[PDB]
């Protein structure tokens, strides 16, 4: 099945500026991005630790 950890980060259509983490497989690390507040995809974490636990090594 497609690995959600490999999907690009998704801001979505809402207009907040909320800092979330995503796993960046090209770089091999959890990175920050801007989430707009709604319609999150799964490569979207509230902390670096949550991102590493779910996606580390993908």
């Amino acid at each position: 099945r497609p690995d959600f950890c490999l999907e690009p980060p998704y801001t979505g259509p809402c207009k907040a500026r909320i800092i979330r983490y995503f796993y960046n497989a090209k770089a091999g690390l959890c990175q920050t991005f801007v989430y707009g507040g709604c319609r999150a995809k799964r490569n979207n974490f509230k902390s670096a630790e949550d991102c590493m636990r779910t996606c580390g090594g993908a």
């Binding site: 809402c14 207009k15 907040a16 500026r17």
Partner: protein, 223 residues
């Protein structure tokens, strides 16, 4: 805000910033203890910052007051975005002055073509990322429900309206959510969502505050 202008310090005295260690949303002060914002701006540990101009520097007119209650509309739908409204109670009453002032709720809905003022500290680029220090402002008209529905087929509910310019270049953007759309001195809208920002044929979508006036008044009074 894309395509706008520098408001000028404290010229929009009802505009607040919601802070969770950094600015993430706007809001509008409606009395000394209550702010209106978007439901998708819900976070625990919100601090409301009043009297701001430069969001990154302490300048002299600020009041920083924690939220004591953050009440999302009970029918907010996080998939359709219907009922995208939240009320925030301040843990202590703001001190009202020329730089910190409330905005009136509407007595009736506004019509297509009514010119409004939209404001916030969100991104100023339609492609790319630049966040301002000081508050930005944009004049924009309410658009017809028919044009809004044509722009966003199947997505516009009775509690949403579009505002802006179909040619592109002028819109609200990430970091403006929750903030005001004010038309002839009344809070008619809350920054909510859109397809990107400032794109041709894709105006911003706003929560239609006039549909919530009784709920806002009764909820504030019950809390």
């Amino acid at each position: 805000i894309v395509g706008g202008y520098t408001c000028g310090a404290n010229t929009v005295p009802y505009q607040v910033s919601l802070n969770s260690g950094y600015h993430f949303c706007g809001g509008s002060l409606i009395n000394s203890q209550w702010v209106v914002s978007a439901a998708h701006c819900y976070k625990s540990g919100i601090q409301v910052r009043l009297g701001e101009d430069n969001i990154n520097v302490v300048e002299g007119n600020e009041q920083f007051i924690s939220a004591s209650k953050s009440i999302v509309h009970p029918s907010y739908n996080s998939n359709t975005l219907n009922n995208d409204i939240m009320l925030i109670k301040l843990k202590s009453a703001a001190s009202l002055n020329s730089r910190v002032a409330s905005i009136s709720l509407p007595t009736s809905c506004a019509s297509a073509g009514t010119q409004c003022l939209i404001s916030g500290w969100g991104n100023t680029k339609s492609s790319g990322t630049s966040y301002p220090d000081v508050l930005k402002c944009l004049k924009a008209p309410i658009l017809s429900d028919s044009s809004c529905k044509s722009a966003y087929p199947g997505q516009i509910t009775s509690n949403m309206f579009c505002a802006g310019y179909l040619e592109g270049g002028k819109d609200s953007c990430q970091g403006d959510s929750g903030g005001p759309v004010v038309c002839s001195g009344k809070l008619q809208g809350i920054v909510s969502w859109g397809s990107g920002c400032a794109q041709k044929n894709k105006p911003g979508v706003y929560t239609k505050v006039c549909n919530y006036v009784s709920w806002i008044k009764q909820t504030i009074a019950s809390n």
